[PDB]
Amino acid sequence: GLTEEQRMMIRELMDAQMKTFDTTFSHFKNFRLPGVKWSQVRKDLCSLKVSLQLRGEDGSVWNYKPPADSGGKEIFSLLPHMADMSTYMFKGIISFAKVISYFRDLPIEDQISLLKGAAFELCQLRFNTVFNAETGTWECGRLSYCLEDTAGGFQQLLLEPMLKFHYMLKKLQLHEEEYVLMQAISLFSPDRPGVLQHRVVDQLQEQFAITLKSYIECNRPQPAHRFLFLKIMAMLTELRSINAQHTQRLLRIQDIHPFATPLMQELFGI
């Protein structure tokens, strides 16, 4: 069963999550929208391809259909918007960490090093909870990002790490407690650049993992949930690779077509 220390741990995790994760994205507004050579590889924005939907509080609906790669500059049409969403999410994640005792007790320099290391991963973890695997769309309140699984794209073309990651993780049908424990394990990674107290962070991480493992063996006895803990841990390892791949993808785009916000520049060292 779960000890008092583990139960207390999950509770502060859950508490921090409900206080800082605006599941309906109610407070996300004033964001930009798409206007009404090295560039070769810089064609990474083609792995995205998502239509956007904005449901007005009055019953109205705005829908955006992205352009097709042609000529050159037009695939950058969705970057400003996506930058505004990323920043909004990042703020939620920063608030998440600062409200966690185990994180506050760490030295200020290490908090920064941990956040710059895990910010992306925690966002993805949060995005997975509003992801609908049936329709292939991230439901963010009045806003929706539906995958272009439709004129040419194929539902089996999950060769994109990001997407495959979301489908697989969603397939595990985790509980809220499991998702927050995953965020704790990712945030408290001793192997992040610039970390000082690598020993503290490492013990903390091990404790979060042990709590997740115990939480699993105490609340999921069905054969379907066997090796669940190991599958989750394997997912986090995948999320780490993807994270590095995305950072590099981001830096290349940022090098030719600046779009990162101040908060994004801080996190990526720009």
CSV table of N, CA, C and O in Angstrom, one decimal, residues 14-85:
chain,number,residue,atom,x,y,z
A,14,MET,N,-0.9,16.8,-6.9
A,14,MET,CA,-2.3,17.0,-7.4
A,14,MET,C,-2.7,18.4,-7.1
A,14,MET,O,-3.3,19.1,-8.0
A,15,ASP,N,-2.5,18.9,-5.9
A,15,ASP,CA,-2.8,20.2,-5.5
A,15,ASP,C,-2.2,21.3,-6.4
A,15,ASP,O,-2.9,22.2,-6.9
A,16,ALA,N,-0.9,21.1,-6.6
A,16,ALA,CA,-0.2,22.1,-7.5
A,16,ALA,C,-0.8,22.0,-8.9
A,16,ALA,O,-0.8,23.0,-9.6
A,17,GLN,N,-1.2,20.8,-9.4
A,17,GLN,CA,-1.7,20.6,-10.7
A,17,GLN,C,-3.0,21.3,-10.8
A,17,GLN,O,-3.2,22.1,-11.8
A,18,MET,N,-4.0,21.1,-9.9
A,18,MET,CA,-5.3,21.8,-10.0
A,18,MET,C,-5.2,23.3,-9.9
A,18,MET,O,-5.9,24.0,-10.6
A,19,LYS,N,-4.2,23.8,-9.1
A,19,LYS,CA,-4.1,25.3,-9.0
A,19,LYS,C,-3.4,26.0,-10.1
A,19,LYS,O,-3.6,27.2,-10.3
A,20,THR,N,-2.7,25.2,-11.0
A,20,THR,CA,-1.9,25.8,-12.1
A,20,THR,C,-2.2,25.3,-13.5
A,20,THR,O,-1.7,25.9,-14.5
A,21,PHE,N,-3.1,24.3,-13.6
A,21,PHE,CA,-3.4,23.8,-14.9
A,21,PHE,C,-4.9,24.2,-15.3
A,21,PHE,O,-5.8,23.7,-14.7
A,22,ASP,N,-5.0,25.2,-16.1
A,22,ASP,CA,-6.2,25.8,-16.6
A,22,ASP,C,-6.8,24.9,-17.7
A,22,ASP,O,-6.6,25.2,-18.9
A,23,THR,N,-7.4,23.8,-17.3
A,23,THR,CA,-7.9,22.8,-18.3
A,23,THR,C,-8.8,23.3,-19.3
A,23,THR,O,-8.9,22.6,-20.4
A,24,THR,N,-9.5,24.4,-19.1
A,24,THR,CA,-10.4,25.0,-20.1
A,24,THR,C,-9.7,26.1,-20.9
A,24,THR,O,-10.3,26.7,-21.8
A,25,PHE,N,-8.5,26.4,-20.6
A,25,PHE,CA,-7.8,27.5,-21.3
A,25,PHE,C,-8.5,28.8,-21.3
A,25,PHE,O,-8.3,29.7,-22.1
A,26,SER,N,-9.4,29.0,-20.3
A,26,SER,CA,-10.2,30.2,-20.1
A,26,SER,C,-9.4,31.5,-20.1
A,26,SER,O,-9.8,32.5,-20.7
A,27,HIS,N,-8.2,31.5,-19.5
A,27,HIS,CA,-7.3,32.6,-19.4
A,27,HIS,C,-6.3,32.8,-20.5
A,27,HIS,O,-5.4,33.6,-20.4
A,28,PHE,N,-6.5,32.1,-21.6
A,28,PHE,CA,-5.6,32.2,-22.8
A,28,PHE,C,-6.3,33.0,-23.8
A,28,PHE,O,-7.4,32.6,-24.4
A,29,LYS,N,-5.8,34.3,-24.1
A,29,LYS,CA,-6.5,35.2,-25.0
A,29,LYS,C,-5.5,36.2,-25.5
A,29,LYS,O,-4.4,36.3,-25.0
A,30,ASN,N,-5.9,37.0,-26.5
A,30,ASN,CA,-5.1,38.1,-27.0
A,30,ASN,C,-3.9,37.5,-27.8
A,30,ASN,O,-3.0,38.2,-28.2
A,31,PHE,N,-4.0,36.2,-28.1
A,31,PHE,CA,-3.0,35.6,-28.9
A,31,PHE,C,-3.1,35.9,-30.4
A,31,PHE,O,-4.2,36.2,-30.9
A,32,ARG,N,-2.0,35.8,-31.1
A,32,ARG,CA,-2.0,36.0,-32.5
A,32,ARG,C,-2.6,34.9,-33.3
A,32,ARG,O,-2.7,33.8,-32.8
A,33,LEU,N,-3.1,35.2,-34.5
A,33,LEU,CA,-3.7,34.2,-35.4
A,33,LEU,C,-3.0,34.4,-36.8
A,33,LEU,O,-2.5,35.4,-37.1
A,34,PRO,N,-3.1,33.3,-37.6
A,34,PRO,CA,-2.5,33.4,-39.0
A,34,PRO,C,-3.2,34.4,-39.9
A,34,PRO,O,-4.4,34.3,-40.1
A,35,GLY,N,-2.5,35.4,-40.4
A,35,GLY,CA,-3.1,36.4,-41.2
A,35,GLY,C,-4.3,36.0,-42.0
A,35,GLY,O,-4.3,34.9,-42.6
A,36,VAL,N,-5.3,36.9,-42.0
A,36,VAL,CA,-6.5,36.7,-42.8
A,36,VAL,C,-6.3,37.0,-44.3
A,36,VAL,O,-5.3,37.6,-44.7
A,37,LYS,N,19.9,25.7,-49.9
A,37,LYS,CA,19.9,26.6,-48.7
A,37,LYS,C,19.5,25.8,-47.5
A,37,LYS,O,18.9,24.7,-47.6
A,38,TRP,N,19.8,26.3,-46.3
A,38,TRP,CA,19.4,25.7,-45.0
A,38,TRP,C,17.9,25.5,-44.9
A,38,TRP,O,17.5,24.6,-44.1
A,39,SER,N,17.2,26.3,-45.6
A,39,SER,CA,15.7,26.3,-45.5
A,39,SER,C,15.2,24.9,-45.9
A,39,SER,O,14.1,24.5,-45.5
A,40,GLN,N,16.0,24.1,-46.6
A,40,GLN,CA,15.7,22.8,-47.0
A,40,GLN,C,15.2,22.0,-45.8
A,40,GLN,O,14.0,21.6,-45.7
A,41,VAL,N,16.1,21.7,-44.8
A,41,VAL,CA,15.8,21.0,-43.6
A,41,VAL,C,14.8,21.8,-42.8
A,41,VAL,O,14.0,21.2,-42.0
A,42,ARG,N,14.9,23.1,-42.9
A,42,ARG,CA,14.0,24.0,-42.2
A,42,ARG,C,12.6,23.8,-42.5
A,42,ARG,O,11.7,24.6,-42.1
A,43,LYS,N,12.3,22.8,-43.3
A,43,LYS,CA,10.9,22.4,-43.8
A,43,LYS,C,10.4,21.4,-42.8
A,43,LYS,O,9.6,20.5,-43.2
A,44,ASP,N,10.7,21.6,-41.5
A,44,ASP,CA,10.2,20.7,-40.4
A,44,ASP,C,8.8,21.1,-40.1
A,44,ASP,O,8.1,20.3,-39.5
A,45,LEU,N,8.3,22.3,-40.4
A,45,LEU,CA,7.0,22.7,-40.1
A,45,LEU,C,5.9,21.9,-40.9
A,45,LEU,O,4.7,22.1,-40.7
A,46,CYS,N,6.4,21.0,-41.7
A,46,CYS,CA,5.5,20.2,-42.5
A,46,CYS,C,5.0,18.9,-41.7
A,46,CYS,O,4.1,18.3,-42.1
A,47,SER,N,5.8,18.6,-40.6
A,47,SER,CA,5.4,17.5,-39.8
A,47,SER,C,4.3,17.9,-38.9
A,47,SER,O,3.7,17.0,-38.2
A,48,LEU,N,4.0,19.2,-38.8
A,48,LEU,CA,2.9,19.7,-38.0
A,48,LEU,C,1.6,19.5,-38.7
A,48,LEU,O,0.9,18.5,-38.5
A,49,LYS,N,1.2,20.5,-39.5
A,49,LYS,CA,0.0,20.5,-40.3
A,49,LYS,C,-1.2,20.2,-39.4
A,49,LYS,O,-1.6,19.1,-39.2
A,50,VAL,N,-1.8,21.3,-38.8
A,50,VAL,CA,-3.0,21.2,-38.0
A,50,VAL,C,-3.9,22.3,-38.3
A,50,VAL,O,-3.5,23.5,-38.6
A,51,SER,N,-5.2,22.0,-38.3
A,51,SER,CA,-6.2,23.0,-38.6
A,51,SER,C,-6.6,23.5,-37.2
A,51,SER,O,-6.6,22.8,-36.2
A,52,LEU,N,-7.0,24.8,-37.1
A,52,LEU,CA,-7.4,25.4,-35.9
A,52,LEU,C,-8.8,25.8,-35.9
A,52,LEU,O,-9.4,26.2,-36.9
A,53,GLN,N,-9.5,25.6,-34.7
A,53,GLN,CA,-10.9,26.0,-34.6
A,53,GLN,C,-11.1,26.8,-33.4
A,53,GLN,O,-10.6,26.5,-32.3
A,54,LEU,N,-11.8,27.9,-33.5
A,54,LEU,CA,-12.1,28.9,-32.5
A,54,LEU,C,-13.6,29.0,-32.3
A,54,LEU,O,-14.3,29.6,-33.1
A,55,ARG,N,-14.1,28.5,-31.2
A,55,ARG,CA,-15.6,28.5,-30.9
A,55,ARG,C,-15.9,29.7,-30.0
A,55,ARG,O,-15.5,29.8,-28.9
A,56,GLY,N,-16.6,30.7,-30.6
A,56,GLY,CA,-16.9,31.9,-29.8
A,56,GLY,C,-17.9,31.7,-28.7
A,56,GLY,O,-18.7,30.7,-28.8
A,57,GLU,N,-17.9,32.5,-27.7
A,57,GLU,CA,-18.8,32.4,-26.6
A,57,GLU,C,-20.2,32.7,-27.0
A,57,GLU,O,-21.1,32.5,-26.2
A,58,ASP,N,-20.4,33.2,-28.2
A,58,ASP,CA,-21.7,33.5,-28.8
A,58,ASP,C,-22.3,32.4,-29.7
A,58,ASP,O,-23.4,32.6,-30.1
A,59,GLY,N,-21.5,31.4,-29.9
A,59,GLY,CA,-22.0,30.3,-30.8
A,59,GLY,C,-21.4,30.3,-32.1
A,59,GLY,O,-21.6,29.4,-32.9
A,60,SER,N,-20.6,31.3,-32.4
A,60,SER,CA,-19.9,31.4,-33.7
A,60,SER,C,-18.6,30.5,-33.7
A,60,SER,O,-18.1,30.2,-32.7
A,61,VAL,N,-18.2,30.2,-34.9
A,61,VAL,CA,-17.1,29.3,-35.1
A,61,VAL,C,-16.2,29.8,-36.2
A,61,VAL,O,-16.6,30.0,-37.3
A,62,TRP,N,-14.9,29.9,-35.9
A,62,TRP,CA,-13.9,30.3,-36.8
A,62,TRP,C,-13.0,29.1,-37.1
A,62,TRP,O,-12.6,28.4,-36.1
A,63,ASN,N,-12.7,28.8,-38.3
A,63,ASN,CA,-11.9,27.7,-38.7
A,63,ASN,C,-10.7,28.0,-39.6
A,63,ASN,O,-10.9,28.8,-40.6
A,64,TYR,N,-9.6,27.5,-39.3
A,64,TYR,CA,-8.4,27.8,-40.1
A,64,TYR,C,-7.8,26.5,-40.8
A,64,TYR,O,-7.7,25.5,-40.1
A,65,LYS,N,-7.5,26.6,-42.1
A,65,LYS,CA,-7.0,25.5,-42.8
A,65,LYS,C,-5.6,26.1,-43.3
A,65,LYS,O,-5.6,27.0,-44.0
A,66,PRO,N,-4.5,25.4,-42.9
A,66,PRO,CA,-3.2,25.8,-43.3
A,66,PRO,C,-2.9,25.6,-44.7
A,66,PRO,O,-3.5,24.8,-45.4
A,67,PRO,N,-1.9,26.4,-45.2
A,67,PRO,CA,-1.5,26.4,-46.6
A,67,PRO,C,-0.6,25.2,-47.0
A,67,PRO,O,-0.5,24.3,-46.1
A,68,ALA,N,-0.2,25.1,-48.2
A,68,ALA,CA,0.7,24.0,-48.6
A,68,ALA,C,2.1,24.5,-48.9
A,68,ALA,O,2.2,25.6,-49.4
A,69,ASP,N,3.1,23.6,-48.6
A,69,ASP,CA,4.4,24.0,-48.8
A,69,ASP,C,4.6,24.3,-50.3
A,69,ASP,O,4.5,23.5,-51.2
A,70,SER,N,5.0,25.6,-50.6
A,70,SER,CA,5.2,26.0,-52.0
A,70,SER,C,5.9,27.3,-51.9
A,70,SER,O,5.7,28.2,-51.1
A,71,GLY,N,6.8,27.5,-52.9
A,71,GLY,CA,7.6,28.7,-53.0
A,71,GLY,C,8.6,28.9,-51.8
A,71,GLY,O,9.8,28.5,-51.9
A,72,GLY,N,8.1,29.4,-50.7
A,72,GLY,CA,8.9,29.6,-49.5
A,72,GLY,C,8.2,30.0,-48.2
A,72,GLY,O,7.8,29.2,-47.4
A,73,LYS,N,8.1,31.4,-48.1
A,73,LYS,CA,7.5,31.9,-46.8
A,73,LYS,C,5.9,31.9,-46.8
A,73,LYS,O,5.3,32.8,-47.5
A,74,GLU,N,5.3,31.0,-46.1
A,74,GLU,CA,3.9,30.9,-45.9
A,74,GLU,C,3.6,29.8,-44.9
A,74,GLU,O,2.5,29.6,-44.4
A,75,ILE,N,4.7,29.0,-44.6
A,75,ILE,CA,4.6,27.9,-43.7
A,75,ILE,C,5.0,28.4,-42.3
A,75,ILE,O,5.0,27.6,-41.3
A,76,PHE,N,5.2,29.7,-42.2
A,76,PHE,CA,5.6,30.4,-41.0
A,76,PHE,C,4.3,31.1,-40.5
A,76,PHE,O,4.4,31.8,-39.5
A,77,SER,N,3.2,30.9,-41.2
A,77,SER,CA,2.0,31.6,-40.8
A,77,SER,C,1.4,31.2,-39.5
A,77,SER,O,0.7,32.0,-38.8
A,78,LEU,N,1.7,30.0,-39.0
A,78,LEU,CA,1.2,29.5,-37.7
A,78,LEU,C,2.1,29.6,-36.5
A,78,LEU,O,1.8,29.4,-35.4
A,79,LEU,N,3.4,30.0,-36.8
A,79,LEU,CA,4.4,30.2,-35.7
A,79,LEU,C,4.0,31.2,-34.6
A,79,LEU,O,4.1,30.9,-33.5
A,80,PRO,N,3.6,32.4,-35.0
A,80,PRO,CA,3.2,33.3,-33.9
A,80,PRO,C,2.2,32.8,-32.9
A,80,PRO,O,2.4,32.8,-31.7
A,81,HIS,N,1.1,32.2,-33.5
A,81,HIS,CA,0.1,31.6,-32.7
A,81,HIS,C,0.6,30.5,-31.8
A,81,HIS,O,0.4,30.5,-30.6
A,82,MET,N,1.3,29.6,-32.4
A,82,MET,CA,1.9,28.5,-31.7
A,82,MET,C,2.8,29.0,-30.6
A,82,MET,O,3.0,28.3,-29.5
A,83,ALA,N,3.5,30.1,-30.9
A,83,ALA,CA,4.4,30.6,-29.9
A,83,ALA,C,3.6,31.2,-28.7
A,83,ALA,O,4.0,31.0,-27.5
A,84,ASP,N,2.5,31.8,-29.0
A,84,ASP,CA,1.6,32.3,-27.9
A,84,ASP,C,1.0,31.2,-27.1
A,84,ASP,O,0.8,31.4,-25.9
A,85,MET,N,0.8,30.0,-27.7
A,85,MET,CA,0.2,28.9,-26.9
A,85,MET,C,1.3,28.3,-26.0
A,85,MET,O,1.1,28.0,-24.8
